[PDB]
Design a protein around this nucleic acid. Structure first.
Lengths: 155, 208, 135, 126, 103, 99
RNA sequence: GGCCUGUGUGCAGGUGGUGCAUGGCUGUCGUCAGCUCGUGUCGUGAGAUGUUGGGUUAAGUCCCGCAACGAGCGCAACCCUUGUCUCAUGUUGCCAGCACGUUAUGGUGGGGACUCGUGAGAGACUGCCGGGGUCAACUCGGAGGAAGGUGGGGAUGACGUCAAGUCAUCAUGCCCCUUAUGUCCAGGGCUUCACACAUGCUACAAUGGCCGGUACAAAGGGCUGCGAUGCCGUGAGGUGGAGCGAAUCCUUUCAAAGCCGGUCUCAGUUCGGAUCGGGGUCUGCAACUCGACCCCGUGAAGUCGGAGUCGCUAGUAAUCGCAGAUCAGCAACGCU
């Protein structure tokens, strides 16, 4: 985009729930075009959470998202013989997106015998403040603290 | 390889075919017949210049038209040459030979014939400026000749390097489809080796 | 508006410019506009405005022009070498910070003043009028 | 009578929009025996959602061409067009929603020099 | 990585004495000396065999892998020795320059 | 009634159209029943190649030898009209299937 | 006189060499926007200016300027295709309103109604509303419209380089062969293998493997060719030939991923399929070297992969399947 960016795609609302982060979620967990498989996995997992908690899973989902969603991240740069990492603030769009990416990719390497269970337990764990997603987010904040020194670059 | 045949590029749009028929199963046969025809044409006459070779087939008969500005050198005044060719046509299985010879109006506005005249001048003994330039003028003096180009290659006067430099005047819009174009080629004798020639003629535009 | 580089020297090419002016005016008169693109007709209007603001004199010259008169000497010195190259007697009211003694027929005056310049343009207009009248 | 059409990547379907119930017919079956996919159901029903006319207009249509997604898109297009034919005044809140544009996202020609449309081979510099 | 220099000796159609092989492997070790980043060395030894030649009998193409940037040295001469040495010196220019720009 | 079915083949739509018009004019002469030029689809035979010899397979060139087609169902076969239609000579890019 | 029997004679043939002798033909930098001429002036001359400066552009596209005026190959547009719509339109295809078979079924008469197929043609042009802008280009927001601002994709490769490649597609200037570098034959090899490199395919599993049931696509190909109905064979296939030079028939009324149902429960496994021993099928005179397919048994290495590296901005990527040609039959996972 040396000439300029282009628009973002207009996410649909969910037929069942009333939230577009859920269609974002299925489209981030998708793999090899099996959109309906993503859909049924997600709906099964969220209803598993419903029977685990006695309430809507969406609230605990967004609470987990409040836990694992940063607003600050890293952005490197090569300067003067030693490449420097730098803190950069993160708009909420990419914040939510990268949070979900963390969520999926650290869900996959669990041992619930099945993706639906791995995912549901990870979401519950992050709502509670235990998931490896949360752990990595804390590592990110740790890095930003270690490298506050380079904010005067303002870049 | 830069530039395709303008004829072959505008073939279905502006220009037209040169051997028209329809056939589902006699197709290979008609093709080998037609190549043998054109080969025997070149071998039966070379003093004159065949501009084109074109005509068609039906259930039974196998007609031809053919263009040349000097049919007087070609055809039997009494019938010698046309009869030898009807015999060649019997030999290679035409059997109903409507050999209907024709000639052009402006031989200078014909790409193939201008190139053949040029190459004749070259294979005689002759140099390059007067032949080239005089063909250019001979064409450009005529009404529809709105543009021209020439692209000769070969070993002019000026030992061994395969040199090639072009001449032109008018317009040569070869990426433009409403344009009419005429292409012209040659590849034959010369002492040192071969001389090649390409020619482009431009003849107004077409709106239809 | 403007001086062209090389009228008086390369007169036979600006002659062709007049010929194309005639061709384009003929197109306009015959009225063939939507025969080709509207944008191209608008660009023809551009061409015609430019060609008319930069050329009026050849429309009646045609006739091996004489290097007689001068417009804005100091800033269009480029108009004099086009004239003295051929050497015909040149005249202008002197643009009064210049080399005076190039020109065969110099005449002092002003370089800027609207009033004196209109006056002396009327003077030379009068000269031409009397020459033609007593022809 | 009423007869109109929709098209989405080789998914043609003709539509008879009856004034009856919300009973749907898709070549002898319904919207849940054909299309067991709630997202497709949402796409198909959203014009009814828009004009608030669910269970006001029956449909009779023929499946032809395309797959499920193309069929659904062409269906809702054709239904929108039928609704414009019933009454125009809903139109300026439909193109507002873009339930009328014939989706011009069709397949690309598989080109040469490649494995498919754009994926080139592994360019080694060896 | 010291024998990891993947020697590739070769000639399309030349009388290739096997002491040319000694020459090539030694002259390529000579740059193993001062570049410890080396994976591949594809090399040729070509011959145009035209009559009444244009002063350039033999020809050589050389290419080498480094970590990312690949190196390319082409040469031409009458025989093996000027070809070897000239392509070697061109590679030396390349590699001095590469290890000057590496840091 | 009795039916006759003529299936025309050619490469140029200009010729198939002109011949269809001339033929239907001849049918119109003797009052014989016409259905007209019902358009069938087109064939698209394709034969890919390589442009140059000895290598450069990435460069290619396509070609397409189509064949336009028309059915003209003629009815009321007056054998005088048949004698009329059988013996028209036409451009040679057309071949005919009288059945 | 046709013909060949031979005699030799002109010879005929060369895949023998030189792509750095050549034509053609093509790849390439690069579908990147530049490359040049006439006349003109400047300069002793090489040469310069024009083509430089400001804005804008998909861009030497265009505007405001001046020793330059203009011009040509170019870019753009006229081409096809896809995208909406009108007129005509009726079989081999639609078949609603109709009627008639009613298990296989548009199956048949019947209507051009929606599709539809093929042809002609309007429609998009900053055309229009407004804001910026030398008021100029040009751009920023709007309306309608199917599409909105070079709608998208193709085709089209400026001068030229790279002595790029091609004397084996072909043709060709030179030199060499001619009792043989030619030429007719049977066998073998071009599939060798202690290794390296490059392109790909299926895998390393539960978004999964296995079994069962059910639905919708476009596209092409077919005569001494395509081939089902019935049955036998586990299944490769096997006699048989309806019906088709073909929107008819074979191409199942054209599929697979997918939906639903049952089991497997994280593992060197119901993963994975190699390799190997058997037994068979088919095309061909011919299946050892050296073919594909099927069944049985065999069940390996391989547990997401280092440095670094390739590709991709929209119906694109990623994945499942199909078809065609070259083809007797096959290495076709390749190519289109």
């Amino acid at each position: 985009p040396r000439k300029g960016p282009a628009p973002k795609r207009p996410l649909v609302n969910d037929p069942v729930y009333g939230s577009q982060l859920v269609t974002q979620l299925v489209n981030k967990v998708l793999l090899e075009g099996k959109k309906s498989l993503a859909e049924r996995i997600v709906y099964g997992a969220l209803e598993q959470a419903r029977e685990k908690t006695g309430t809507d899973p969406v609230v605990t989902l967004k609470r987990a998202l409040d836990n694992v969603k940063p607003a600050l991240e890293v952005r490197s740069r090569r300067v003067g013989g030693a490449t420097y990492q730098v803190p950069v603030e993160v708009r909420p769009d990419r914040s939510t997106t990268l949070a979900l990416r963390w969520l999926v990719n650290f869900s996959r390497q669990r041992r619930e015998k099945t993706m639906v269970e791995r995912l549901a337990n990870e979401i519950l764990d992050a709502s509670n403040g235990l998931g490896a997603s949360v752990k990595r987010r804390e590592d990110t904040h740790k890095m930003a603290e270690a490298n506050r020194a380079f904010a005067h670059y303002r870049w | 390889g830069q530039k395709i045949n303008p004829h072959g590029f505008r073939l279905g749009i502006t220009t037209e075919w040169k051997s028209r028929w329809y056939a589902d199963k006699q197709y290979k046969d008609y093709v080998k017949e037609d190549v043998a025809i054109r080969k025997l044409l070149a071998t039966g006459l070379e003093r004159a210049g065949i501009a084109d070779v074109e005509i068609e087939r039906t259930r039974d008969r196998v007609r031809v038209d053919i263009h040349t500005a000097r049919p007087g050198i070609v055809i039997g005044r009494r019938g010698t040459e046309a009869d030898r060719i009807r015999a060649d046509l019997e030999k290679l299985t035409g059997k109903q030979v409507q050999l209907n010879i024709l000639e052009v109006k402006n031989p200078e506005s014909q790409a193939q014939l201008v190139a053949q005249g040029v190459a004749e001048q070259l294979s005689n003994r002759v140099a390059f400026r007067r032949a080239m330039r005089k063909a250019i003028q001979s064409a450009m003096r005529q009404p529809n000749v709105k543009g021209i180009r020439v692209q000769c290659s070969g070993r002019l006067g000026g030992a061994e390097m395969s040199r090639s430099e072009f001449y032109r005047e008018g317009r040569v819009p070869l990426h433009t489809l409403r344009a009419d174009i005429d292409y012209g080629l040659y590849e034959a004798k010369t002492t040192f080796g071969r001389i090649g020639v390409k020619v482009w003629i431009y003849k107004g535009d077409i709106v239809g | 508006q403007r001086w062209l580089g090389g009228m008086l020297t390369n007169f036979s090419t600006v002659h062709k410019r007049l010929q194309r002016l005639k061709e384009l005016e003929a197109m306009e008169q015959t009225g063939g506009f939507e025969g080709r693109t509207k944008k191209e007709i608008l660009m023809l209007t551009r061409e015609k405005n430019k060609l008319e603001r930069s050329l009026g004199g050849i429309r009646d010259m045609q006739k091996v022009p004489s290097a007689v008169w001068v417009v804005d000497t100091n800033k269009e010195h480029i108009a004099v070498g086009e004239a003295r190259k051929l050497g015909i007697p040149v005249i202008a009211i002197l643009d009064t910070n210049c080399d005076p003694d190039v020109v065969d027929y110099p005449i002092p005056g002003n370089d800027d003043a609207i009033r004196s310049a209109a006056l002396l343009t009327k003077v030379i207009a009068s000269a031409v009028a009397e020459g033609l009248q007593a022809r | 009578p009423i007869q109109t059409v929709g098209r989405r990547k080789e998914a043609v379907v003709r539509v008879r929009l009856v004034p009856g119930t919300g009973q749907f017919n898709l070549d002898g079956r319904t919207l849940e025996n054909y299309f067991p996919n709630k997202v497709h159901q949402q796409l198909i029903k959203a014009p009814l959602v828009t004009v608030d006319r669910v269970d006001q207009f029956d449909i009779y249509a023929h499946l032809d061409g395309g797959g499920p997604s193309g069929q659904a898109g062409a269906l809702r297009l054709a239904i929108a067009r039928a609704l414009i034919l019933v009454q125009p005044e809903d139109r300026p809140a439909l193109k507002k929603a873009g339930f009328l544009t014939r989706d011009p996202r069709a397949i690309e020609r598989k080109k040469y020099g490649l494995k498919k449309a754009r994926k080139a081979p592994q360019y080694s510099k060896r | 990585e010291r024998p990891h220099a993947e020697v590739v000796v070769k000639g399309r159609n030349v009388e290739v004495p096997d002491h040319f092989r000694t020459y090539v492997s030694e002259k390529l070790s000579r740059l193993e000396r001062f570049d410890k980043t080396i994976y591949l060395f594809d090399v040729e030894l070509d011959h145009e065999r035209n009559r009444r030649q244009r002063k350039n009998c033999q020809h050589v193409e050389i290419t080498a892998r480094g970590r990312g940037p690949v190196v390319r040295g082409e040469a031409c001469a009458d025989s093996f020795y000027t070809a070897f040495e000239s392509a070697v010196q061109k590679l030396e220019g390349r590699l001095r320059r590469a290890k000057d720009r590496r840091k | 009634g009795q039916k006759i079915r003529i299936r025309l083949k050619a490469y140029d739509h200009e010729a198939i159209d002109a011949s269809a018009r001339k033929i239907v004019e001849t049918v119109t002469r003797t009052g014989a029943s016409v259905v007209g030029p019902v358009p069938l689809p087109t064939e698209k035979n394709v034969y890919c190649v390589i442009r140059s010899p000895h290598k450069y397979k990435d460069s290619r060139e396509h070609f397409e030898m189509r064949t336009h087609k028309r059915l003209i169902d003629i009815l009321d076969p007056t054998p005088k009209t048949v004698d009329a239609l059988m013996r028209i000579d036409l451009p040679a890019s057309v071949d005919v299937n009288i059945q």
